[PDB]
């Protein structure tokens, strides 16, 4: 079999092309897609419980290849009181609960809730429990989200929200033919 | 310091309807930090035992160190992409020969496997994506279709003669009976116990 760990922060990005690539050449291969936070993901590469990892931007034992970038959007429920304004201030954002996906660069409110994936974060933002940053991909997969969520205008005092997705693997680990084909295919492209 | 409550939702239950319990807690304890994490059922249990989480959402089927109360049931349905080749022409033997996308916490007993060959994933978003790419059929919570109406445009329920298994989760609220539960977790437990 082939086990790929997609780190929890990247679950709701556009990653399935790489699995379709594997299945097209090796339809008999059993693929296992697991998800865990990044720190756990590296340990799975080292202990061999996963052969490949999809991570966002590593010691001497790992190698990687860059795949793609994924845009993220700060959003709030359209029925949240803050959504009635065309614009918002930093003071207002500071006083609004943020729903943060994590296990300086990402926290901008005094009060926050932590979750480990964007499905959980989205559900809570949809219940008006706060604002947060979600992958643009979620709005492509669920266009009705645009009817319920609105982009929050914080771009003048926040970094560009984005992931740079890498394919990562352990140098010393046994790699079957399928894992090597994907690595070689990506390197060639 | 600062009031906090971590609830672990086991991976298979991530795409069920659980946010009402979070909203009930937030309205009664507005100053409370509520952290929602997900993990395999076995990891969720260890989180209760080592204090990393105070409550767990699990589905029925635990040792004597845990206490639980049943919460609700969630329906799941076997689905396939409307553009899958099989979505034209379907017998049970064809389903046996079509890849299943199995969702299980990251050991598969035969009651979970309905086809000869399968892929494994640890959450229904991942499974749904691969079904959507025509990579197989699989069992998804009905809640996913409520949350994403696009799924009705792209997927359809399997209707196969001689294939009528019933798929449901019975959701339990679980805690460690030797752990310091704060007042907020105790409130939820007492609230559910009264509802019963």
Cβ-based neighbours of B126, under 8 Å, separated by 6 or more: A6, A11, A33, A35, B103
Task: Report the CATH number at residue A16.
Answer: 3.40.190.10
| Same-domain status, A57 and A99 | no
Cβ-based neighbours of A131, under 8 Å, separated by 6 or more: A74, A75, A76, A80, A82, A93, A96, A97, A98, A99, A109, A125, A152
| Same-domain status, B11 and B79 | no
CA distance A172 to chain B (A): 23
| Same-domain status, B46 and B99 | no
Distance of CA B30 to the CA centre of its chain: 27
| Same-domain status, B106 and B150 | yes
Query: Are the beta carbons of A96 and A83 closer than 8 angstroms?
Result: no
| Same-domain status, A12 and A84 | no
Give me the residues paired with residue B100 across strands.
B118, B137
Closest to B120 (Cβ–Cβ): which among A32, A111, A142?
A: A32
Inter-helix orientation angle A16-25/B124-132, to 10°: 60
Distance of CA B117 to the CA centre of its chain: 23
Query: Are the beta carbons of B22 and A124 closer than 8 angstroms?
Result: yes
Taking CB atoms within 8 Å and a gap of at least 24, the contacts of A155-163 are A157/A90, A157/A108, A158/A74, A158/A108, A159/A105, A161/A71, A161/A72, A161/A73, A161/A74, A161/A133, A162/A69, A162/A70, A162/A71, A162/A72, A163/A9, A163/A10, A163/A13, A163/A56, A163/A57, A163/A69, A163/A70, A163/A72, A163/A135
- For an interface test with A, give the residue of B35, B47, B53 to mutate (most A CBs within 10 A): B35
Any chain A CB within 8 A of the CB of B35? Answer: yes
Closest to B37 (Cβ–Cβ): which among A19, A23, A115?
A: A115
Chain B residue closest in CA terms to A128: B23
| Same-domain status, B114 and B189 | no
When divided into structural domains, chain B yields a total of 2
* Pairing mode, strands B100-103 and B137-141: parallel
Say what the resolution is, in angstroms: 2.0
Q: Which residues of B42-67 are buried (b: 16+ CB within 10 A; e: fewer)?
A: ebbbebbeeeebbbbbbbeeeeeebe
Query: Are the beta carbons of A109 and A76 closer than 8 angstroms?
Result: no
Structural domain span for residue B45? 4-72+169-195
Task: Report the CATH number at residue B108.
Answer: 3.40.190.290
| Same-domain status, A156 and A128 | yes
| Same-domain status, A142 and A172 | no
Give the separation between CA A23 and CA A173, rounded to whole angstroms.
Answer: 22
Chain A residue closest in CA terms to B154: A141
| Same-domain status, B80 and B160 | yes
């Amino acid at each position: 079999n082939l086990t790929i760990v997609v780190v929890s922060e990247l679950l709701h990005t556009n990653w399935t092309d790489y699995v379709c690539l594997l299945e097209s050449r090796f339809p008999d291969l059993q693929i296992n897609i697991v998800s865990a936070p990044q720190e756990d993901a590296l340990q799975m590469l080292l202990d061999g419980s996963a052969q490949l990892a999809l991570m966002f931007e590593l010691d001497n034992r790992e190698q990687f290849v860059e795949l793609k970038r994924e845009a993220l959007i700060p959003v709030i429920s359209k029925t949240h009181p803050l959504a009635s304004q065309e614009h918002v201030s930093y003071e207002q954002i500071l006083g609004t609960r943020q729903i943060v996906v994590a296990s300086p660069e990402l926290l901008f409110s005094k009060h926050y809730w932590r979750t480990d994936n964007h499905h959980s974060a989205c559900l809570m933002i949809l219940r008006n429990l706060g604002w947060g940053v979600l992958p643009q991909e979620m709005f492509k997969e669920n266009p009705e989200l645009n009817n319920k969520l609105k982009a929050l205008d914080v771009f003048d005092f926040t970094p560009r929200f984005e992931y740079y997705v890498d394919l990562v693997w352990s140098r010393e680990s046994e790699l079957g033919a399928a894992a090597r084909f994907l690595i070689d295919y990506i390197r060639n492209k």
